[PDB]
Scaffold this active site. Structure first.
Site, mmCIF file in Angstrom:
data_model
loop_
_atom_site.group_PDB
_atom_site.id
_atom_site.type_symbol
_atom_site.label_atom_id
_atom_site.label_comp_id
_atom_site.label_asym_id
_atom_site.label_seq_id
_atom_site.Cartn_x
_atom_site.Cartn_y
_atom_site.Cartn_z
ATOM 1 N N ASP A 187 -92.070 -55.732 46.838
ATOM 2 C CA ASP A 187 -91.979 -55.272 48.227
ATOM 3 C C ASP A 187 -91.825 -53.724 48.246
ATOM 4 O O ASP A 187 -90.975 -53.186 47.532
ATOM 5 C CB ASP A 187 -90.747 -55.939 48.863
ATOM 6 N N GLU B 29 -96.740 -53.864 46.231
ATOM 7 C CA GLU B 29 -97.071 -53.678 47.633
ATOM 8 C C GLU B 29 -96.873 -52.190 47.827
ATOM 9 O O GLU B 29 -95.742 -51.702 47.926
ATOM 10 C CB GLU B 29 -96.127 -54.441 48.566
HETATM 11 O O1 CTS Z 1 -92.318 -57.337 55.408
HETATM 12 C C1 CTS Z 1 -91.711 -56.053 55.185
HETATM 13 C C2 CTS Z 1 -90.171 -56.183 55.085
HETATM 14 O O2 CTS Z 1 -89.703 -56.279 56.451
HETATM 15 C C3 CTS Z 1 -89.409 -54.975 54.375
HETATM 16 O O3 CTS Z 1 -88.638 -55.391 53.227
HETATM 17 C C4 CTS Z 1 -90.345 -53.903 53.926
HETATM 18 N N1 CTS Z 1 -91.565 -54.392 53.285
HETATM 19 C C5 CTS Z 1 -92.429 -53.230 53.055
HETATM 20 C C6 CTS Z 1 -93.378 -53.272 54.271
HETATM 21 C C7 CTS Z 1 -93.770 -54.755 54.133
HETATM 22 O O4 CTS Z 1 -94.517 -55.245 55.264
HETATM 23 C C8 CTS Z 1 -92.378 -55.429 53.935
#
Ligand code: CTS
Ligand code: CA
Length: 556
Positions: free
Chosen positions: A199, A253
């Site tokens: 993430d 990601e």
């Molecule tokens: O779903 C999200 C989440 O709310 C956060 O931990 C950030 N993340 C990075 C951005 C990506 O969409 C993801």
């Protein structure tokens, strides 16, 4: 040699919270997923990526973790997780879990400890700074509303949180923290997980001194947050200390980073990550504020795909998807979800997804043709991000509540989070209780039970496409060439490998169109088509296309 299994695998993304409830509390769970493995195996799925499944207060549905070694109470027990693992293996399937280590929940023991005083051994597991000029430390904004700095009365200092106020960012500059994160990964890797997805991997390194973002940087603050000076050094350390000793595929990601930076993360030689998850395509028509959309055409769609494919070079590798938990439904976003075109455009999009160079990820429900949800009020959204927009744009008076509703109804992440539609019983057979988020009313016609035994359904089309990709090497690991980057009506491209070349032609317009093949190229065979009354004739040098028609052909 031979290419890694992940390069020719077909993945399926499961958002557990909204997949299958087995105990009536309204939330999907592990038993629900385990129960449906035959369904996914029947579809042809080789592997599954599940969203965060760890202990969490759920201010961000899993992305705010309070304990990295305990399963989320709503999903079940560690025992249930283990069973899911075993049942997957029985079917020769692989599991990819989500790893959230840019930040933790503010309910995690490390944070409770860290915040108690200025002198405890966990103080530096997070970022604590003095405010300035009676205000926060600097002008850092948060993705979920207001400042990214939150003051804590216990010490008088502010802690950093790029995302939610209850998602304090972890301090990767602290060696002990890094080591705890590595021990944590081995905990799950030792259990046998086959893949880990990170993430927001590009935000791990923070900028020393936390100087204010300049006016220009402020316009796209996400990008500056991916510029920490130690990013790749940390990623490389993590690979060397962990993944070097395992057989798991890694995926990053890469949120907020310019595409030209991507190779640094996925070039196999650099020993960082194996696959990339970027936002260029899925947000190709999204405004900077993330809640408005900008009109685009197929020309923009394909040119973006062209650039993404290009940065993977010879040593890199991309994932490809048209949907996920953070965006509107694929058919609604890229296709035409109107009653008369939903199925046709959905099939067409499926053809694109399964013939792209890279590892395809099918988000739950898109195999059925699920659409956006008809939100009526701001209260119909559960998403913390929408609350953030209200705080940042409605309370500040930059926009009215109605403007927010109008626009965010088409961009909201909740469009992808409504309960998976299994059949036409109450709440589409997702739960026997009250769903945590309302089921789309179109479940009476769009549901798995109705499409499963219908050879003409969007489900069967996906199944047939998956089958075909599995049997055609060129469709997974073959080269890719866009026939005409500037064409805004018909998307046509080839995939080739070991002398074999395939042609994919997809009409993105709801009108009849024509396509002439490149000089010297001819149809040899037709592998499959959707919305077509007749296959081309062997040797054909052009194609006549129905509205939203798609086809995969072997050429000569
Ligand atoms: O779903 C999200 C989440 O709310 C956060 O931990 C950030 N993340 C990075 C951005 C990506 O969409 C993801
Ligand atoms: Ca449940």
């Amino acid at each position: 040699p031979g290419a890694p299994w992940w390069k020719s695998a077909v993945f399926y993304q499961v958002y557990p919270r909204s997949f299958k409830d087995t105990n009536g509390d309204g939330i999907g769970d592990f038993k629900g997923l385990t129960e449906k493995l035959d369904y996914l195996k029947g579809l042809g799925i080789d592997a599954i990526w599940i969203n965060p499944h760890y202990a969490s207060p759920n201010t961000d549905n899993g992305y705010d973790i309070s304990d990295y070694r305990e399963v989320m109470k709503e999903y079940g027990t560690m025992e249930d997780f283990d069973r899911l693992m075993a049942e997957l293996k029985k079917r020769g399937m692989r599991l990819m879990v989500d790893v959230v280590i840019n930040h933790s929940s503010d309910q995690h023991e490390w944070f409770k400890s860290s915040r108690a005083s200025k002198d405890n051994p966990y103080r530096d597991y997070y970022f604590w700074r003095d405010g300035k000029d009676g205000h926060e430390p600097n002008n850092y904004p948060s993705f979920f509303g207001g400042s990214a700095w939150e003051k804590d009365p216990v010490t008088g200092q502010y802690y950093l949180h790029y995302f939610g106020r209850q998602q304090p960012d972890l301090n990767w500059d602290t060696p002990k923290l890094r080591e705890e994160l590595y021990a944590m990964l081995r905990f799950w890797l030792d259990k046998g997980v086959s893949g880990m997805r990170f993430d927001t991997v590009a935000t791990y390194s923070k900028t020393p001194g936390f100087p204010d973002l300049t006016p220009e940087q402020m316009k796209n603050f996400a990008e500056a947050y991916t510029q920490g000076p130690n990013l790749h050094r940390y990623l490389q350390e993590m690979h060397e200390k962990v993944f070097d000793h395992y057989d798991a595929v890694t995926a990053g990601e890469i949120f907020g980073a310019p595409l030209n930076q991507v190779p640094l993360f996925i070039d196999s030689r650099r020993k960082e990550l194996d696959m990339a998850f970027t936002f260029d395509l899925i947000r190709y028509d999204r405004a900077l504020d993330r809640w408005h959309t900008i009109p685009r055409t197929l020309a923009d769609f394909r040119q973006t795909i062209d650039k993404v494919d290009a940065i993977a070079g010879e040593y890199g590798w991309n994932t490809f998807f048209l949907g996920n938990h953070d965006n509107p439904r694929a058919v609604s976003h890229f296709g035409d979800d109107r009653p008369q075109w939903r199925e046709a455009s959905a099939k067409a999009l499926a053809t694109v997804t399964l013939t792209q160079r890279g590892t395809p990820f099918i988000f739950q429900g898109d195999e059925l043709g699920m659409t956006n949800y008809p939100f009526k009020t701001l209260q119909d959204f559960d998403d913390i991000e929408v609350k953030g927009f209200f705080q940042d744009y409605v309370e500040t008076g930059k926009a009215t509540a109605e403007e927010l509703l109008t626009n965010v109804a088409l961009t909201s992440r909740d469009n992808a989070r409504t309960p998976f539609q299994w059949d036409d019983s109450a709440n589409a057979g997702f739960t026997t209780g009250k769903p945590w988020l309302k089921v789309n009313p179109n479940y009476t016609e769009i549901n798995a039970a109705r499409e499963i035994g219908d050879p003409k359904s969007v489900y069967s089309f996906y199944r047939n496409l998956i089958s075909i990709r599995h049997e055609t090497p060129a469709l997974s690991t073959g080269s890719y060439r866009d026939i005409d980057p500037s064409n805004a009506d018909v998307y046509a491209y080839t995939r080739s490998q070991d002398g074999e070349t395939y042609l994919v032609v997809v009409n993105f317009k709801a009108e009849p169109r024509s396509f002439t093949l490149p000089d010297g190229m001819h149809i040899a065979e037709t592998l499959i088509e959707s919305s077509s009354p007749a296959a081309p004739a062997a040797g054909a040098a052009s194609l006549e296309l129905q509205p939203w028609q798609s086809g995969i052909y072997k050429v000569k």
